[PDB]
Design an enzyme around this catalytic site. Structure first.
Site, short mmCIF file in Angstrom:
data_model
loop_
_atom_site.label_atom_id
_atom_site.label_comp_id
_atom_site.label_asym_id
_atom_site.label_seq_id
_atom_site.Cartn_x
_atom_site.Cartn_y
_atom_site.Cartn_z
N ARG A 136 0.79 -1.23 0.00
CA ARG A 136 0.00 0.00 0.00
C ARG A 136 0.83 1.30 0.00
NH1 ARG A 136 -5.24 -0.58 1.30
NH2 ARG A 136 -5.16 0.92 3.04
N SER A 167 16.02 13.94 6.54
CA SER A 167 14.58 14.17 6.57
C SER A 167 13.78 13.03 7.19
CB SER A 167 14.08 14.49 5.16
OG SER A 167 12.68 14.57 5.09
N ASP A 169 -2.74 11.64 10.06
CA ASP A 169 -4.11 11.44 9.56
C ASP A 169 -4.79 12.80 9.45
OD1 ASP A 169 -6.87 10.70 9.15
OD2 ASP A 169 -6.72 8.99 10.40
N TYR A 212 -6.38 4.80 18.49
CA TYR A 212 -5.74 5.12 17.22
C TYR A 212 -5.63 6.63 17.07
CZ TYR A 212 -5.39 6.28 12.26
OH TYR A 212 -5.03 6.84 11.05
N1 LIG Z 1 -4.82 4.60 3.82
C1 LIG Z 1 -5.48 5.58 4.43
O1 LIG Z 1 -6.75 5.97 3.97
C2 LIG Z 1 -4.90 6.33 5.59
C3 LIG Z 1 -5.61 7.38 6.16
C4 LIG Z 1 -5.05 8.16 7.16
C5 LIG Z 1 -3.76 7.91 7.59
N2 LIG Z 1 -3.05 6.89 7.02
C6 LIG Z 1 -1.69 6.64 7.52
O2 LIG Z 1 -0.78 6.37 6.46
C7 LIG Z 1 0.12 5.34 6.81
C8 LIG Z 1 0.06 4.21 5.78
O3 LIG Z 1 -1.27 3.92 5.44
P1 LIG Z 1 -1.69 2.45 4.92
O4 LIG Z 1 -3.16 2.39 4.78
O5 LIG Z 1 -0.79 2.12 3.78
O6 LIG Z 1 -1.28 1.57 6.23
P2 LIG Z 1 -1.61 0.00 6.40
O7 LIG Z 1 -1.77 -0.72 5.07
O8 LIG Z 1 -2.80 -0.18 7.25
O9 LIG Z 1 -0.37 -0.58 7.23
C9 LIG Z 1 0.96 -0.30 6.88
C10 LIG Z 1 1.84 -1.29 7.63
O10 LIG Z 1 1.94 -1.05 9.03
C11 LIG Z 1 2.56 -2.21 9.56
N3 LIG Z 1 2.24 -2.46 10.97
C12 LIG Z 1 1.02 -2.48 11.58
N4 LIG Z 1 1.20 -2.76 12.89
C13 LIG Z 1 2.51 -2.95 13.12
C14 LIG Z 1 3.25 -3.26 14.26
N5 LIG Z 1 2.67 -3.67 15.39
N6 LIG Z 1 4.62 -3.38 14.15
C15 LIG Z 1 5.26 -3.19 12.94
N7 LIG Z 1 4.53 -2.88 11.83
C16 LIG Z 1 3.17 -2.76 11.92
C17 LIG Z 1 2.11 -3.39 8.69
O11 LIG Z 1 3.24 -4.15 8.27
P3 LIG Z 1 3.17 -5.73 7.92
O12 LIG Z 1 2.17 -5.95 6.78
O13 LIG Z 1 4.52 -6.17 7.52
O14 LIG Z 1 2.75 -6.55 9.14
C18 LIG Z 1 1.36 -2.73 7.54
O15 LIG Z 1 1.65 -3.29 6.28
C19 LIG Z 1 -0.28 4.85 8.19
O16 LIG Z 1 0.55 5.47 9.15
C20 LIG Z 1 -1.70 5.36 8.34
O17 LIG Z 1 -2.08 5.61 9.68
C21 LIG Z 1 -3.60 6.10 6.04
C1 LIG Z 2 -10.86 3.53 6.83
C2 LIG Z 2 -10.45 4.99 7.20
O1 LIG Z 2 -11.62 5.84 6.98
C3 LIG Z 2 -9.13 5.59 6.44
O2 LIG Z 2 -9.07 5.27 5.01
C4 LIG Z 2 -7.85 5.13 7.21
N1 LIG Z 2 -7.26 3.96 6.90
C5 LIG Z 2 -6.13 3.46 7.52
C6 LIG Z 2 -5.48 4.19 8.60
N2 LIG Z 2 -4.34 3.65 9.22
C7 LIG Z 2 -3.79 2.42 8.82
N3 LIG Z 2 -2.63 1.87 9.44
N4 LIG Z 2 -4.39 1.72 7.81
C8 LIG Z 2 -5.52 2.18 7.15
O3 LIG Z 2 -6.03 1.38 6.13
N5 LIG Z 2 -6.04 5.46 9.01
C9 LIG Z 2 -7.29 6.02 8.34
#
Ligand SMILES: NC(=O)c1ccc[n+]([C@@H]2O[C@H](COP(=O)([O-])OP(=O)(O)OC[C@H]3O[C@@H](n4cnc5c(N)ncnc54)[C@H](OP(=O)(O)O)[C@@H]3O)[C@@H](O)[C@H]2O)c1
Ligand SMILES: C[C@H](O)[C@H](O)C1=Nc2c(nc(N)[nH]c2=O)NC1
Ligand SMILES: NC(=O)c1ccc[n+]([C@@H]2O[C@H](COP(=O)([O-])OP(=O)(O)OC[C@H]3O[C@@H](n4cnc5c(N)ncnc54)[C@H](OP(=O)(O)O)[C@@H]3O)[C@@H](O)[C@H]2O)c1
Ligand SMILES: NC(=O)c1ccc[n+]([C@@H]2O[C@H](COP(=O)([O-])OP(=O)(O)OC[C@H]3O[C@@H](n4cnc5c(N)ncnc54)[C@H](OP(=O)(O)O)[C@@H]3O)[C@@H](O)[C@H]2O)c1
Ligand SMILES: NC(=O)c1ccc[n+]([C@@H]2O[C@H](COP(=O)([O-])OP(=O)(O)OC[C@H]3O[C@@H](n4cnc5c(N)ncnc54)[C@H](OP(=O)(O)O)[C@@H]3O)[C@@H](O)[C@H]2O)c1
Ligand SMILES: C[C@H](O)[C@H](O)C1=Nc2c(nc(N)[nH]c2=O)NC1
Ligand SMILES: C[C@H](O)[C@H](O)C1=Nc2c(nc(N)[nH]c2=O)NC1
Ligand SMILES: C[C@H](O)[C@H](O)C1=Nc2c(nc(N)[nH]c2=O)NC1
Lengths: 253, 253, 265, 265
Positions: C12, C152, C158, C171
């Site tokens: 992702r 950097s 979020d 969270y």
């Molecule tokens: N996607 C969104 O809509 C969204 C929205 C707001 C903020 N964010 C922020 O953007 C960042 C990336 O988003 P994403 O959706 O790509 O994240 P994600 O797919 O949910 O997770 C990214 C990775 O975090 C690792 N992880 C989770 N728990 C862990 C732990 N206990 N120790 C070590 N690694 C751990 C996992 O690694 P493994 O697979 O190897 O276990 C996972 O692949 C995150 O910080 C998220 O909070 C995302």
């Molecule tokens: C589902 C939610 O509304 C939004 O897309 C977010 N997704 C994620 C998140 N954080 C992690 N680690 N993974 C997600 O898929 N923060 C916010």
């Protein structure tokens, strides 16, 4: 010692409630109005009957335009403050409450020029001039004769950071008013004049989205906050905007 | 070949933004008020490097009427956008950079200050955005550009107001509201609206106060951020204000 | 050849950040917890394009001690940074991307609460703190003449936490803690010219394990485009912030949300 | 008639003033303490002499660690026990004030690091979370016809954390987490009519273990009055937010800082 409060747009709704709340605390109140003459005078009669010589009414268009005796907005604002000094010899509290609110769409002229002057004047420019006039009077008063609890409250909007579709000028003017709150609080701190903001979300709608109670607020639910901020118990608070919105700004679509 | 309109483009940050956009391939309309010589020298430099890639247009962006029936600020703003369409047939990027900055202490010359600081920093940007948006809406969907971007130059430090600059601080506050309101309303036309807020840049002591590097920024350190926000890589960003201040807003007295 | 450490780099957004940095010339240390297969496939791809340009390191970033005297979270974090120095002799960029995300509603199951707290807080806040600390110590211990010229740190925040998602308190709290880390670290690390910023997505590559209409309903709420973002739409921002062109930016959180935070119910 | 308030870290300074202010409004007060046993019991004696059976004391370490009683006692259990103490003695808990807080440096530049993290995070964020959870559960488990009519939770935040104090990263992070808890809990507990707000002091009863000129230099920076605040100047705000006049306010943080956050270096 009987303190004096100047409340703009005091004729009805939140403004009336703020005037009533201050009056109940012992304040003498100058009730400003623009077109609600009848309502303002009925309110003044009620307050004066309760306590003689505790209310007056003054009329002024707070839009950023010149009126007929041409009189500028600044002069009209200075005259509002001066009316408090002429009648009671003081002005301790200023509440910038008066506000126009209507759409100024960016996507489908004299109507747009009066809209700009009206929405910006009532919500931002007039409050600036009013604060300026209020501050000068305090500065021109010898230190031993000054009041001990100066407070200015600007009525802001808890929801402007999540803009209402089509209300750009209004939203911009409220943003300007927030900056005035912070700039005036800093500059007027040496004269011990506090400047704060109170931002309603949904109040006295003429709904089910508000997290707390699933309803808009009553006028008192907002005015009580304003009165508290003017109290000596709130004397360390300045330059801050307090939301009174039942959690509405915590929502997302 | 896309087109960018940059207000106050003659020197300092405006010139750097115009240069940065030009380097990316943009044709640039350089607006100016009093810096005719500097604006024309810049246009000559850009036109020599790439023919018919720069033009200059003059306008007072203060909220007043000028002589030709007097001409309103809105008309002058619409004329700025129209100049881009008349010469190149398009306007993809608008950068609201022009800005007056001087004291308006709270403790006739105050009339022109109000109109000048509010016009350049807030009212003109509103009308410019309005005119920009109308031209996009009036264009058939098949002929529209694929990367519309509006950048408002804000201030990273206005939440910690500079003593005595109330109107300027208020106007920047209004500009932040415009950024959010316009971003929301123009989203359907895929027009992005963002803000870039310098702290201390290209200063004419204070320098030693900036946590990062203990100096004010160069013009490029700010303009590179603006250019990135206009790029298609930044296409999901809208309604946000980006500070370029080296951590200055993290400080306290 | 500069080095980047990306946590949760297997898929992702993390994968896209790793790819984006690699495309700019960076050698990348790809951290993972449970996605071994994905991480190794990504490393193989990057190493094939450019030899010795990717490695993988495993670590549970939850705030718990692991079996070797137990190994603490701090030690595991220091080991992650150390892996970059052992293999390439440097670490210029740190991206705190790893993050757990699940409900902790306020309204033999003590295990679930103890582990949820340590997991959500560790990945989103505590591990980033220790990682930054370890990253900073390595730069401080390097003679000024051998130091990199573009340090950097990017914390993935979020854009929507100020409008909390119902039932995700821990969270939301952890992301709030991460914002404070961004500001505090930026100020304290400024003398070593280490920049610390945040990138806050709104809806990105929205998980679609729900009815299509419900999924389309969620993304239609985003003002710009009426959709969630692509991984690149977020990662490109992260890459820009790490570039020398963004060298005057520090302590700031950049929203990449298509105006979603501007909405109200 | 006769509501109950639980105030953590109630022994001295702001906590004491909040406890006094609530007591003066008619509240029965549960005064929590960690190490200030003598001070807490002296305060309880004063309040009980003024109005019989209007004050009690309970002790608890709010750090995120297990304590020895068979099994070790977790932080959650200790937090639930605090709320339970109010129900056992008075049959109710209308107000919770999360005031207890540790504050010391955690510079970025062994047993010391592990206990600082658990202590600063536990007192400032994790304990408040569990306390809120326990408080909310006791309200939910009460039949609607029996519930109080003015539930209010106040979290003591910091007006200055957005302008971080150099070297206090974990504290700053924890206060950030506490702001997230304020908004998240306000949203989730709104249906039960439980309001959750924050009060953020700037400089209040500033500790003076330093040269007089240094002390004077620091407080002179507050724009309004050029001094730190008194305890009452903060506690009066807390009391107002708990009053029924403030019943439409929820999820908001109120600064009580005399304009200090408006300053720049
Ligand atoms: N996607 C969104 O809509 C969204 C929205 C707001 C903020 N964010 C922020 O953007 C960042 C990336 O988003 P994403 O959706 O790509 O994240 P994600 O797919 O949910 O997770 C990214 C990775 O975090 C690792 N992880 C989770 N728990 C862990 C732990 N206990 N120790 C070590 N690694 C751990 C996992 O690694 P493994 O697979 O190897 O276990 C996972 O692949 C995150 O910080 C998220 O909070 C995302
Ligand atoms: C589902 C939610 O509304 C939004 O897309 C977010 N997704 C994620 C998140 N954080 C992690 N680690 N993974 C997600 O898929 N923060 C916010
Ligand atoms: N009510 C809400 O849900 C809500 C939400 C967010 C913010 N607010 C803010 O709270 C404040 C009060 O709210 P409200 O709903 O009570 O306001 P309101 O009813 O809409 O208007 C208050 C008064 O403002 C006066 N006014 C308007 N334009 C004027 C002008 N050109 N010159 C002089 N006076 C003018 C009017 O006075 P006359 O009748 O005498 O002409 C009017 O009675 C306002 O500042 C508003 O922005 C309210
Ligand atoms: N530099 C900083 O440290 C700093 C800090 C915070 C914010 N900013 C913002 O960044 C932007 C650019 O900064 P800057 O320092 O480069 O600005 P600047 O040098 O002060 O001014 C830019 C230009 O604005 C034009 N201008 C002023 N008043 C005008 C009016 N009445 N009508 C039309 N044009 C007018 C002037 O054009 P002419 O010369 O042609 O008359 C001037 O050259 C501004 O928006 C500023 O507010 C800068
Ligand atoms: N005073 C200020 O200028 C200022 C500024 C910003 C924010 N605040 C916030 O306002 C609140 C009160 O301020 P204050 O200065 O009065 O606080 P304080 O005197 O520093 O401490 C309040 C109490 O917290 C308790 N405490 C500390 N660690 C604990 C732990 N591990 N477990 C249980 N209790 C613990 C202590 O109780 P015992 O003595 O019983 O051990 C202490 O008396 C705090 O949340 C603080 O963060 C204060
Ligand atoms: C309708 C809208 O959502 C909300 O109730 C508001 N009303 C008003 C407002 N401002 C003024 N002056 N008057 C209103 O009636 N701001 C927000
Ligand atoms: C020192 C001063 O605070 C700073 O350099 C700023 N300069 C300027 C500004 N805005 C304009 N238009 N021009 C400036 O020179 N905002 C802030
Ligand atoms: C010294 C500092 O600037 C300020 O007065 C603060 N003190 C304290 C604080 N938090 C706690 N728990 N105790 C304090 O004495 N936050 C900020």
């Amino acid at each position: 010692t009987v303190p004096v409060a100047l409340v703009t747009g005091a004729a009805k709704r939140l403004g009336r409630s703020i005037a009533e709340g201050l009056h109940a605390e012992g304040y003498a109140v100058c009730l400003h109005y623009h077109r609600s003459a009848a309502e303002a005078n009925a309110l003044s009669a009620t307050l004066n009957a309760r306590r003689p010589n505790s209310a007056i009414t003054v009329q002024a268009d707070l839009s950023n335009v010149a009126t007929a005796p041409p009189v500028t907005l600044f002069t009209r604002c200075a005259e509002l403050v001066a009316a408090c000094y002429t009648h009671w010899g003081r002005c301790d509290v200023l509440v910038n409450n008066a506000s126009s609110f209507y759409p100024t769409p960016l996507l489908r002229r004299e109507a747009m020029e009066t809209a700009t002057a009206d929405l910006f004047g009532s919500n931002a420019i007039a409050p600036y001039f009013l604060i300026k006039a209020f501050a000068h009077r305090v500065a021109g008063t010898p230190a031993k004769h000054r009041g001990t609890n100066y407070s200015i409250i600007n009525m802001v909007d808890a929801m402007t950071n999540q803009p209402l579709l089509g209300y750009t000028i209004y939203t911009m003017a409220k943003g300007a008013l927030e900056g005035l709150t912070r700039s005036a609080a800093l500059e007027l701190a040496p004269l011990q004049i506090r400047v704060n903001g109170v931002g309603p979300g949904l109040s006295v709608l003429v709904r089910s989205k508000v997290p707390l109670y699933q309803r808009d607020s009553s006028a008192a639910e907002v005015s009580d906050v304003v009165i508290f901020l003017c109290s000596s118990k709130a004397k360390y608070i300045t330059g801050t905007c307090v939301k009174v919105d039942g959690g509405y700004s915590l929502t997302r679509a």
